[PDB]
Amino acid sequence: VKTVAVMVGSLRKDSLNHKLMKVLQKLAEGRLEFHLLHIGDLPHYNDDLWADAPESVLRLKDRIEHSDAVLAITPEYNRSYPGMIKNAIDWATRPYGQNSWKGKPAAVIGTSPGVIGAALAQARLKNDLLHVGTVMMSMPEAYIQWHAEAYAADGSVTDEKTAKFLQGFVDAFVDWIEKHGL
Amino acid sequence: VKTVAVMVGSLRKDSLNHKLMKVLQKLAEGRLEFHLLHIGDLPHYNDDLWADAPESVLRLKDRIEHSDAVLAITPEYNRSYPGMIKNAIDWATRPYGQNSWKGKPAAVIGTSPGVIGAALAQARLKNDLLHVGTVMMSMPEAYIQWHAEAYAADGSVTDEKTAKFLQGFVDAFVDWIEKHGL
Numbered sequence A, B: 001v002k003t004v005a006v007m008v009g010s011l012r013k014d015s016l017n018h019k020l021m022k023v024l025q026k027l028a029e030g031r032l033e034f035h036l037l038h039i040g041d042l043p044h045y046n047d048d049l050w051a052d053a054p055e056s057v058l059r060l061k062d063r064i065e066h067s068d069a070v071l072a073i074t075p076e077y078n079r080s081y082p083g084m085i086k087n088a089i090d091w092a093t094r095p096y097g098q099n100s101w102k103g104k105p106a107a108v109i110g111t112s113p114g115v116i117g118a119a120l121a122q123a124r125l126k127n128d129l130l131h132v133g134t135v136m137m138s139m140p141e142a143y144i145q146w147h148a149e150a151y152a153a154d155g156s157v158t159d160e161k162t163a164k165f166l167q168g169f170v171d172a173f174v175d176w177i178e179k180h181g182l
Ligand SMILES: Cc1cc2c(cc1C)N(C[C@H](O)[C@H](O)[C@H](O)COP(=O)(O)O)c1[nH]c(=O)[nH]c(=O)c1N2
Pocket: A009, A010, A011, A012, A014, A015, A016, A017, A018, A075, A076, A077, A078, A079, A080, A111, A112, A113, A114, A116, A117, A118, B047, B090, B091, B093, B094
């Protein structure tokens, strides 16, 4: 089993990206073990805080470093991804010389109720995670328009086409981690 | 005098982007009146909070709406701009139908100790502010490598070449607001 440090780019109760995380976790059970990064617990980045580092920042870095891979699951806000994710990215690259992300196999996925499926957010997040040294998966693209009727309450995917698609993403990520991980 | 809602993308005590804000404010005094947007006081975006909107969010939107223009002064973190700025951007676009940024003349500037002068951050921030409906100034580019010896403690620019350059940016922004504002 490979461990995955997961960022979900939404805090709200009924987040679709949180639902997507659970769907992916269920599809991946037995092959990937997800551990959430608690990005909502991070203060806004402030370099002065390294004098007494926030526990949340220490925990963030420890989990990334102890995980085999990274997965980001992002909504799209105003045609890019949420700042809360970028704030987490930046915290874990520091202190200088201590970039936790370096060399980690990564992937990005996300969902929107709209047909664009968070594609613009995803492209930007792929670029920004590439620029902190991750080994970034590109295929298959997964710009998911959320359809509530395609999923069950337990996270099962009831729609066969959607299940095949998401399974293809999971399978690719498993293979990506095996090939490109440390 | 035109009013300007200003974002400074750093919270730390000795921030160079904060020093740059004060330099620009001094150069612009009498023509532009700066009002800081308190982006460090915003919680991480969470759509659930609109049920009881945070005061910081309400103040942010009110100041943007009541200003003639917007100025962002950004550092570069891992080849883009800080998430705290994107978080502010997203808050002020909401609720749906109530985008405070729409039609506002805007400009972006920033500084780094390195020679790249926060250019990658600035390009991304220009794009993200364009995508929320600002009327975005592009010229002159201002990718400022910070040189402490070029500035005095009162914000004066002691280096003549630097003063001419930053005055050019301020003059262009005043004209931009006059031409492109409401
Ligand atoms: C500030 C802000 C900005 C945007 C959005 C929302 C909000 C609040 N939404 C809608 C978004 O896709 C929808 O609310 C998702 O359901 C949010 O993801 P979670 O459900 O919270 O995971 C959105 N959707 C979209 O497809 N493209 C976009 O650019 C935006 N922009």
